[PDB]
Design a protein around this ligand. Structure first.
Ligand SMILES: C[S@@+](CC[C@H](N)C(=O)[O-])C[C@H]1O[C@@H](n2cnc3c(N)ncnc32)[C@H](O)[C@@H]1O
Ligand SMILES: C[S@@+](CC[C@H](N)C(=O)[O-])C[C@H]1O[C@@H](n2cnc3c(N)ncnc32)[C@H](O)[C@@H]1O
Lengths: 270, 270
């Protein structure tokens, strides 16, 4: 079997992440879960490798890698980070996106670099959501912790309470998170990278924006133009939003290399 | 045991790469080896993940990753790439370093991104050297191949003969490579990243430059200011070069973040 290249979707056989994404004719109808921050913070990072993310078109970010032997050869392993994440990171710095004091959601966070940027940026509350439970425990939580002062700009260890972590399908996450405060406060910003690859979940995603976004807030969404096979894309999604007539969209940036990538802004009409 | 951070040297216990680097009181006195390009090119990449290197302060480069399960959770694994590699990549683009027609050596190549840049840049001959045999077979060779047109700017498959691959200690590599042509042609460029961390091998490295560098060529060396424990660094190395009085050095760029990093040019006096 051929190697996965950039142009394989999150659901292709070749993709490392296939089994961390909802798929099939009857996926989990399990409820969503909030994940607590472990008591022992140093233990989440034991034996890991903390690596600076290279490139100067973003803030200083760290990523946690795991040493994994194969035929006694040491690999540094991490969860795949999709291209559009870096586009959105670059766009935060270039467009001087303001994070201080905001309530922020990283929807479909994977490694959590978007939320972590907001965290380091002075956001009051940062929520992270991934579909997969293990992604949150094994990757997201450790990554956030590694971007605190624990070891060692970086927020002190005592600010970690500002971050909260959720797993499950968007419908479930929505119901759960709406019940998690005496009176729910909407997000000022929802940041999301590569979450419109699958048209089967556009209904759920739209409904999530409708229930969770503040009146005056916005979604910053990064996406490839099209995803082959699974069949989602930017045009298709804008059509979907346009038909429902609740939000407006606006293309903030095109990244032009080979197949195009987009950063898109979604706000309420209004 | 605490996680390895940027400020651990290549020989620290925490470092993933410790056993791929020469160390101890009696390392291998084995001869160096040239490694042939395998016959079956597609098979070198089977089941791998080909990932674009993010950041736009370098040319488009691809990196081969391996899917490695742990508790049934899929990691994308790769050999560690040291920070200074990216500094030197940025410096190639910023300073418009000219590669076309040159004979180039990537000394201590690891993943081989420096040599690959030269390859994509039109160099006539590109030699890759790592200490470790497995590094070359498992990482370097596949990385070069992944940056050819095989799958599918990128050089066609038919240009791969221009790349040659070597493993072993620098003294041995030198003797070997000097015997590998009816009349050896010196390198116009030697590119090297993080190879002066260990003062025990400064003699060997200097001798390698002396025997292998063209009269009118140059070494472009990227290094951290200092490496703790093992104890090498930029000042210490410039002293060493200065004492032997064969080469001159010149600092081309400082990258100023926390502890400093340098790009250094070495030429003959003449
Ligand atoms: C391809 S990944 C991108 C991950 C990360 N944002 C990045 O760019 O590297 C897709 C993300 O969307 C999430 N996701 C996809 N469909 C979902 C759904 N129906 N409900 C909840 N989360 C979903 C996945 O868990 C994952 O975080
Ligand atoms: C820390 S790594 C850097 C690898 C790669 N250049 C990078 O920046 O990611 C050190 C490199 O120097 C090589 N090396 C170190 N000492 C050596 C020696 N005495 N002889 C030959 N190679 C050596 C290693 O094999 C490796 O390629």
């Amino acid at each position: 079997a051929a190697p996965s290249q950039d142009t394989d979707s999150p659901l292709s056989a070749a993709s490392s992440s296939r089994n961390l994404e909802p798929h099939g004719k009857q996926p989990s109808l399990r409820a969503a879960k909030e994940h607590a921050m472990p008591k022992d913070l140093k233990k989440m990072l034991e034996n890991k490798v903390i690596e600076t993310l290279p490139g100067f078109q973003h803030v200083k970010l760290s990523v946690v890698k795991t040493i994994l032997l194969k035929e006694n050869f040491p690999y540094e392993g991490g969860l795949k980070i999709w291209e559009c994440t870096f586009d959105l990171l670059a766009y935060f710095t270039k467009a001087k996106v303001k994070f201080a004091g905001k309530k922020v959601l990283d929807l479909g966070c994977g490694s959590g670099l978007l939320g972590i940027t907001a965290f380091k940026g002075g956001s009051k509350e940062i929520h992270f959501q991934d579909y997969n439970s293990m992604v949150i425990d094994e990757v997201t939580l450790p990554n956030v912790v590694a971007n605190s002062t624990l070891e060692d700009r970086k927020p002190k260890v005592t600010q970690l309470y500002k971050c909260r972590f959720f797993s499950g399908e968007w419908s479930e996450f929505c119901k759960l998170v709406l019940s998690s405060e005496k009176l729910f406060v909407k997000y000022d910003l929802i940041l999301t990278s590569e979450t419109i690859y699958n048209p089967d979940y556009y209904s759920n995603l739209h409904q999530t924006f409708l229930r969770l976004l503040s009146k005056n807030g916005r979604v910053l969404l990064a996406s490839k133009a099209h995803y082959f096979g699974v069949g989602g894309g930017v045009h298709l999604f804008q059509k979907f939003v346009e038909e429902r007539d609740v939000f407006k969209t606006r293309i903030l940036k095109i990244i032009d290399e080979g197949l195009k990538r987009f950063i898109i802004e979604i706000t309420f009409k209004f």
